Amino acid sequence: VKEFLAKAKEDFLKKWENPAQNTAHLDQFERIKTLGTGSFGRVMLVKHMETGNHYAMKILDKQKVVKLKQIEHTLNEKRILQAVNFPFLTKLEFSFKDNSNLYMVMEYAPGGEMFSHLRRIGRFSEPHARFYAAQIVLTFEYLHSLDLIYRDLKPENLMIDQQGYIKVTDFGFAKRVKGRTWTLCGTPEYLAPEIILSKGYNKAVDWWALGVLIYEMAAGYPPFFADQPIQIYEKIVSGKVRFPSHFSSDLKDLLRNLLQVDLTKRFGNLKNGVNDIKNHKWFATTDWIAIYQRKVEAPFIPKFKGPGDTSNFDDYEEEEIRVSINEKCGKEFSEF
């Protein structure tokens, strides 16, 4: 584990210090369908024509990125995503920019968003939730060792692959930080109390977010919800969580230690680190090496209608990929 991580950091740092750049071009891809939408961009299913491979292409409108003050955050995403390498992260295959847009081509996960299946099915059994949670635990162990904070864990950002395993995607708020950082970012339901209270925070906020995810996966709703974000933040800072009666003894206990406002007590943030989580009773049945190696049978496996099947994704209004004849925001995105 410690040896694997050391070698992993060696691989990462080389790519981190000399990022790949301009490794493709738009018209090497056939744009097939919009798989999802964001405030400054969208993700499309595309086919790489020279290989016939299907990919997910994140298209970011440079002007919109600038307007939402996400320049540095978008540079973080691309710089981190091109450097990392882990089974449960969507691999960044290519990146490039043109006059109007930034492009990040990643591995296509045809199983769709966890969000979709979690909402439809209602909730996951504890073994089902545990299976996904373990992959997140390992992914955060990997990311955090690289001094990376993830900062946007949620079902919407957890893609299911052909084998039913998780691919963490969307690194817009990912940041390589040693020490505290301060940006107010994330999704309201998943914000740690630190973030809400403007304290300045560290990777512990990812472990709190793990608590929210596990809860939501197992309960079918998150531990803090309301109609408006303000109401949600009040609940998060309150220091109170109720568990459904069907939650096991062990699960309740894992959640109390994950969803812990006290940093000195929050699991993942103690001297023993992520092993407080790994060695917890709720994870007793979990074979961590087996999960990393993907030799564990997935509780749910998506329907294989074929390559580039999008039936596990919702339908979004398709929209032009317009490329201006003038270069926009050249200086801002120079290093992309």
């Binding site: 405030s39 919407e156 817009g172 970012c185 999704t187 709703y221």
Partner: peptide
């Protein structure tokens, strides 16, 4: 029930990130 309150809430759809 809590499930009923969630499903009746305006935040069962995809949740956007926050910023500033």
């Amino acid at each position: 029930t809590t499930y009923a309150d969630f499903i009746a809430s305006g935040r069962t759809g995809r949740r956007n990130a926050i910023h500033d």
